[PDB]
Write a protein that binds this ligand. Structure first.
Ligand SMILES: Nc1ncnc2c1ncn2[C@@H]1O[C@@H]2COP(=O)(O)OP(=O)(O)OC[C@H]3O[C@@H](O[C@H]2[C@H]1O)[C@H](O)[C@@H]3O
Ligand SMILES: Nc1ncnc2c1ncn2[C@@H]1O[C@@H]2COP(=O)(O)OP(=O)(O)OC[C@H]3O[C@@H](O[C@H]2[C@H]1O)[C@H](O)[C@@H]3O
Lengths: 129, 125
């Protein structure tokens, strides 16, 4: 349904990118964006994107008022973790995937570490340092 | 038919994640659902989002287009940097961000290795 700047993310990958990732909206809680669109570099025969998917993040903490519900970052990393685990058990494994997986799991471990630190201080879900 | 992922986080999880469909190319699933642990007043999920991955390499025929893992990590990267520059920063975020960026760098290395071996977009080791 979508026809083909500052908003596009500058990615680590530079060559042969499948998609562009773009931040949607304005800065919100914490100074972060809470909507992104992943869109193909390819057109269909009449100029629509082959891929145009939106990701909406939980906007406004859980114990704070008026919060839009959505995805949280650890969910995305858990998906990527499951896919790399699968590729590693399959026919096209690689050292690079492994290194990436280990780093993804440690990123997830640090995100959980943040969750538990905020539980322990009784600030999880509030607009607090 | 749970198909639910065993996550690193074990407490206060906002959402569950599920693999949808069957194993595909390379032995991986290409569709996932992120689903609330919370319901609205009539039992519907507050969050029900689906992520469909590029299934079957870009150069082969008969491929379903979609997202690739670098996109998800690039989004999480941006978000963490924004949080880091903002009011509610943390060491934990900084460590997670550095690990996310290194994961992204290892993913690029695969891409660049497959470009140099000139197998990118094909079903080869
Ligand atoms: N790695 C981070 N992940 C999320 N949020 C972060 C991080 N680092 C800093 N923040 C900021 O602290 C607040 C409290 O977060 P929290 O208590 O952990 O939140 P949550 O219950 O999981 O909700 C999540 C939503 O909260 C809102 O505020 C957040 C942000 O402003 C945001 O809009 C969220 O998208
Ligand atoms: N970290 C990995 N990321 C992706 N794919 C991986 C990884 N590790 C191993 N694989 C396997 O090698 C094939 C060639 O991948 P590729 O040549 O790099 O890329 P692609 O053209 O972007 O297509 C992408 C689609 O390809 C299909 O096969 C893939 C997998 O079987 C998959 O269903 C993809 O969803």
């Amino acid at each position: 349904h979508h026809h083909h700047p500052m908003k596009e993310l500058s990615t680590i990958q530079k060559r042969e990118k499948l998609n562009t990732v773009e931040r949607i909206g304005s800065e919100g809680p914490g100074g972060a964006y809470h909507e992104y669109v992943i869109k193909s570099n390819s057109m269909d025969s009449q100029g629509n994107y082959d891929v145009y998917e939106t990701i909406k993040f939980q906007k406004g903490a859980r114990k704070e008022e008026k919060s839009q519900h959505g995805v949280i970052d650890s969910d995305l990393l858990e998906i990527v973790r499951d896919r790399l685990k699968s590729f590693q058990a399959g026919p096209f494994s690689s050292r690079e995937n492994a290194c990436a997986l280990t780093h993804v799991e440690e990123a997830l471990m640090w995100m959980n570490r943040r969750v538990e630190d905020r539980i322990e201080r009784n600030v999880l879900g509030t607009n607090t340092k």
